[PDB]
Symmetry: D2
């Protein structure tokens, strides 16, 4: 797929004509290309979103929802095409690609269903002949910045609420996964999104990234990705005071109390660690097992991890890392751990793979013992199929080790003690706590976190409302002379 | 008077022993001092807030509300002392000082009434034996940065909801107005706020402001003031991803359609321009009057403006600017307007007063004709008793002119046409529209705005909810083996 | 059309074998029949609803909504048939049949869209290790009782939110309009609503009505119709304490201030009086026109009323009344009005065997024309000269549902929003109500309301779970620690 | 204490002059009179309420809240007077009386705090130049009918939210406890409630009951009491369609799974059965204990019940039944039980001797279908049964016409979360006692009543939502059934 830009109702090339090649993480083969958009291209996209705003707002949420549901229908009817794009660009195992596309469909539906239901308020004024009307209206122009790890799902998650609520949009996907975004945009276009309401820009984040986020006409930035990019966005958005929705991943503690159902905890850990090869904002990143069951738990964890097949999406349990850079950084992480004295219980390198897969970015499930609570393995995001384990003995210690993190997104807890479950619901200072089940998050949840997770959140009533600004209209209908306490009446 | 620090439940001096002078805006003479907190004083204060956090959270909102109500009653009983401090520090007219204290009392009541009413949610899970519990919990440590213009109102606005919701607090007030903040803090102390829950740090923002805002342990910053300081706080808080509540002032258009009630519009404009000498986040900053009535309107407005007395708070209608630098900045603005061809219809200089007032920072009501929509007088916040006026002749034009601003907080409209009122409610892209009435904003309102106004808002259910974080707990209580679509069940079979 | 009963997943006859005729109000002749259900059949319907509850509940709102959405799609695909049923059973003008079916489709969509958004709550407990969880759950078994006037719209109105929220349902439509209701149930069944969840019972309300509403397993009654039947239901429903949702119509004041846009007020009034021949819960029932414009207003209104065509659904602007009794009742109202010295400006008589009545305009505040619901193409008009007088005449009524105000004065508009004590106030526009609105009223209007977040929430019950997770000994003020 | 009527801002006697005596449940002696109001007095009270309405509504919630907070303050200053009235009228033990007075204070506080926070809504209209405004407004005239069992608490519970929300009120307390209601009424008047806003009427249910609930000008009826009275109220309020808030008591199952903490379950059971002599809308009325611990549990339950002291409010653990009719009704309950094959494990009769006291009574081996397990007791009598499965426990619990409170003791988190749906009761107390909190929505299933009280949702039962649809296009309207060419 050679992708193009979509600006002011047309598919076009970059004004510079420059492009960037895309490689399969499965095989290493070059498989596509995208347009490297210029700054003038960004301006034209943002101005098109400005010019389309008032007519799009004025349509009302019901007419907007019809277009969004038509998009969903077109996506569902042609879903195989999107599943194949994900498998090609990301190397996801087939069931992960199908689930992701199921999630695009579920999310678009969920958000469109908010039509005419996100009410404003009427409150008492300062007299019987005054009222305060509180309208909820759109922010205006939304810049959507999507990551590579859930390249279809994150696009649906941001576009759907933004459009429903009456914002116009400029979308820029990750440079590793332009194809899934393009395909979704084209579906909204086919469904009848009007000229300029939805724009699509690809390019080097290092050439246009700051420029998009600091532009004077941008009202809201919705973004998922790395901590360092998020920090940079918040710095640059000081220029326009844009509203920020930022999700920057985490370092989820996976906590197994002594009374855990072992099979359910292990099932959930295979999912939390190895789903999408650990390239998940909610991946298990630190494992804490009660000392009474640590040895059995770890023996089983290692035995199951060894049975995971890596390779082609048609048949594998786990896919590859996204690019050569992720593979290099994962190798460095493993070597730093070994250099600090950690002990590798399984994995710690690339697999030995046959045919075309020998050239993809595969990395083995990797399980570490003997790493300190204070170590990089336990304090810095890995985003790869690597995890360290440690023993725990008390509930208070469990909460502290968990909360001892600059991150604050997801967490997992396995236990049958009700007092721990109800107490952890406040003491575990993470945005999502999964008790005796796996993620992922549901659309009806508010996906957010504490500390370095980011700003605001997504999903639920509160998530979609993040795309609406509340404004106040103070009316006096007494029809009588005003009396103002500090304005002498003696003047009138 | 001399202010001190309140750190971990003690009144203390700065650890360097250094202090900074406070000037009277009425006389221009030194009238007090405050401690210059160090980086190490800030650390102890934030550390005390961290250590008090769990036990303050764990009291619950009802018990926290009882302490906050007590503070309210103590403030009320001794209100006169606060009224005096505001008149002394700010030079506010007596009725403005009393109104501000009224507001402190109303706000603290209103926020405390939210006790056990800010509910979380329970939502359907992905099977019948799954639920998603959404709890609302404090962020943790709140840093509150208050401005000089409503130096008692702004403290109440930030401390009441932060505390009610279970956050611990480090307050740093404006260097122009330490006294009113200290006095409020002391009332909270006397009402029984536990040690560490509330800390009070004074010192120049240029010196410790960056340090406070970027600190690894800060979870939320609530701030009101200038646009530049807001932009800086946002840049620095990129280090900790603090939740930001920032209110950065505005450039409120004042719109008077041809069918307006003249008396009401004029009364409201006197209020909107001259209340607090125009040093208000919602001040009338641009005047748009329909061409049919512009000449009568401007004549009446000039005539009323001349009648306002300046000087002592005991009897003035309008007070001084806060400091020498605000006075200089106001003169520059007027001069840049005059050098640009603008017609001064009234004022445009300091008055001539005798006695101590001669050294105070007074400036006359100043009314300007024929500056462009695109001039600095129409595009840059003034925050002083100065306004330009321009004609209008269509509703569409009125909306476009109003929205032609990097600002977006308050706005004012006088008209009897219902179609303009309901339509402007959407087409005027400002956080507050006052229709046939003055401000100020009410506690039940959500004080906020568009564009450069800032982040989030204050007041209403939604304002107090800015100090709570929503967190989810996904529970599976089927008691049955899990089935996960991407995990093969043959890995768990014999 | 011959209709049957749908009980626990089967289309069946009445166990007595008896049936009841349905007449056309266009031609006056018999055009269909429906089953007269017995007590036995009621009990089987309700027991099947009870038997289906837990599995319906446990499916969750998303899976229930998928079925409801498929229902909407099948209805939409076959909409011509339902439009034809309404024109055949009610005689509605073609444009009104098409409207009603648009609103069936709109309503089912809107209610289905509430899936997984009607949250419960979590509040603080009385200590730090105590919480109070507030779940919203179905009431259980819902009895739905529908009127003849919007015989398809009213079915969609009640089935959609009841089903989305996880209640099971026994529906009994009006004996004037069984066909439209059956056709909708059939579509829900075709969509895959499981056995027992939805049941359909026909039978004269005068014969099995009290038995249904009094039944010991019924947890919620949702009904629209006449005031007398609503009152009766609320008496009978004291047996089970069913939660009631009753919409009983009204006596809408239509107020035209001196500054009104005359054209918009006249266009609107033509809609409000003569839409569905006045057989509407929000019909204009009393006309108040400022003395300054009263004459011109009435002259023009009469001129426009006389231009309405009556007869066949294909050609007419206004259909017949529903049946012979309503024709007789409308005559009785007009005759009584004349016997009280009412001045007829136009009409006041029938215009072959159908139940057509002419638009009728009368030219006294306390008379039966002004204090009793007419539900026919008849209205009286009265002069007003102040705002306060206007509010008090409006509010001088045992009814409290809809109302209409034409004015350009913002002070009247904002003030009337509190002073006009009616559930609905239409300012410078016609009805009907929107689904995002909460259709309700004051005084004799009924109980609860329909539409909006609040309306759909009427079908959900709030329950509390108080949990203590201290894991410590309890200390109870009035229980002595020394006992332990 | 002799009480009077408060009608249109004046204290007055019945227009007939007739009065009714009130008896101590501690001694059986006459201790007060109250006025027997006529149908004409009631019309005067309601007309007063009607005449006071617009001025009360137009004050707004903040100003109303101030009057309500002042009433709370005057109540808290003089709280001993109320505590004593509750001990004299009801005979509660001193700490129950103190408890009830704290709850009066807490509830008045809680409801008044809802000032300017119960917002309406703005929703999108059918075009960009339409909106629908949804105002929350008072119903108007509220008739409050309070029971005798919590005779101060229930008055606070009804008056505070009805008044905060801007309704005017006619209060009619139970003929068994007029004193506490009158005292509270006087404090609201002292605090500044204006003329006609709050009226107070006493008299016989058999003279004025129907008449008060069916009156044409009544908008809302809020009532707590017996199933029978609620049913009658619902019949009679068909004449006016009054919005109803009825709480009609219960038959709370109390369920102890095998893994329960025994001490805490027993403590809570002591509270749930004996608090206010079991004359509680949330009282333990049926006991189900896991077969593994049934014997030890019933054993300790009898040993502990034997020790509860009956008698004088200063020193007793449990006071008397409210009047002689409740006394004879309780005996007839315990006798019907023994005549049907039930075993008395403790108590069964009366234990100052002229008063209406009745001992803790624990009945064994009675059928789940028996009068004891199916009909409200409202007295310190309780029947027990074994259980052995979770599904059984739910089915036994839900096998009742009632649906208010229920109690559960267990450490298995799957029963706790599953019971939260499967126990079809408005209130489920898990490893703790009642009573309900002001933030909870006190309500139930089946014959419990209508609507509910407490929480945001409860105060909102006193507001009616109205809609205003506005078109501000300024342009010609187009209506699908009407011709443009006609103009
Ligand atoms: O028996 P119980 O005393 O335990 O409880 P209850 O009869 O339910 O008493 C609760 C309240 O309802 C009143 N009431 C009695 N008959 C009534 C009627 N026909 N209409 C309206 N209210 C009526 C009672 O007044 P009374 O105490 O005067 O009967 C009492 O204030």
């Amino acid at each position: 797929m050679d992708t193009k830009l979509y600006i002011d109702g047309q598919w076009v090339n970059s004004s510079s004509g420059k492009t960037v090649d895309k490689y399969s993480p499965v095989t290493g083969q070059v498989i596509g290309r995208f347009e490297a958009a210029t700054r003038d291209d960004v301006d034209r996209a943002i101005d098109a979103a400005e010019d389309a705003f008032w007519a799009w707002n004025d349509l009302g949420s019901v007419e907007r929802s019809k277009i969004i549901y038509r998009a969903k229908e077109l996506i569902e009817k042609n879903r195989a095409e999107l599943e194949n794009i994900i498998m090609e660009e990301n190397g996801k195992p087939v069931k992960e690609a199908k689930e992701e596309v199921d999630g695009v469909i579920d999310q678009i539906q969920y958000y469109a269903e908010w039509a005419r239901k996100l009410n404003g308020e009427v409150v008492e004024g300062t007299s019987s002949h005054r009222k305060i009307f509180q309208y909820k209206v759109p922010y205006g122009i939304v810049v959507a910045l999507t990551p590579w790890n859930f390249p279809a799902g994150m696009v649906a998650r941001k576009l759907a609420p933004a459009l429903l609520t009456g914002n116009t949009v400029v979308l820029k996907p990750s440079s590793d996964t332009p194809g899934s975004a393009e395909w979704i945009v084209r579906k909204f276009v086919e469904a009848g999104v009007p000229k300029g309401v939805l724009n699509f820009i690809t390019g080097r984040g290092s050439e246009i990234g700051d420029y998009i986020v600091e532009h004077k006409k941008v009202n809201l930035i919705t973004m998922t990705g790395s901590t360092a990019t998020g920090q940079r966005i918040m710095q640059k958005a000081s220029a326009n005071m844009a509203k920020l929705i930022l999700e920057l991943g985490g370092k989820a503690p996976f906590m197994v109390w002594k009374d855990a159902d072992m099979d359910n905890a292990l099932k959930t850990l295979l999912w939390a660690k190895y789903w999408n090869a650990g390239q998940s904002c909610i991946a298990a990143e630190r494992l804490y097992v009660h000392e009474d069951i640590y040895d059995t738990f770890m023996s089983r964890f290692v035995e199951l991890s060894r049975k995971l097949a890596l390779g082609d999406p048609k048949n594998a349990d786990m896919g590859p890392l996204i690019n050569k850079g992720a593979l290099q950084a994962t190798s460095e992480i493993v070597e730093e751990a070994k250099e600090s004295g950690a002990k590798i219980l399984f994995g710690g390198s690339q697999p030995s793979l046959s045919g075309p897969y020998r050239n993809g970015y595969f990395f083995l499930p990797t399980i570490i013992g003997n790493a300190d609570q204070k170590s990089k393995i336990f304090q810095e995001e890995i985003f790869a199929p690597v995890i360290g384990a440690r023993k725990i003995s008390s509930v208070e210690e469990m909460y502290d080790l968990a909360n001892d993190s600059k991150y604050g997104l997801a967490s997992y807890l396995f236990t049958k003690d009700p007092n721990i479950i109800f107490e952890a619901s406040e003491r575990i200072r993470f945005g999502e706590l999964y008790v005796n089940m796996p993620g992922p998050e549901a659309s009806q949840g508010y996906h957010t976190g504490f500390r370095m997770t980011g700003q605001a959140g997504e999903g639920s009533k509160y998530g979609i409302s993040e795309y609406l600004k509340l404004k106040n209209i103070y009316v006096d209908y007494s029809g009588k002379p005003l009396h103002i306490n500090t304005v002498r009446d003696d003047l009138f």
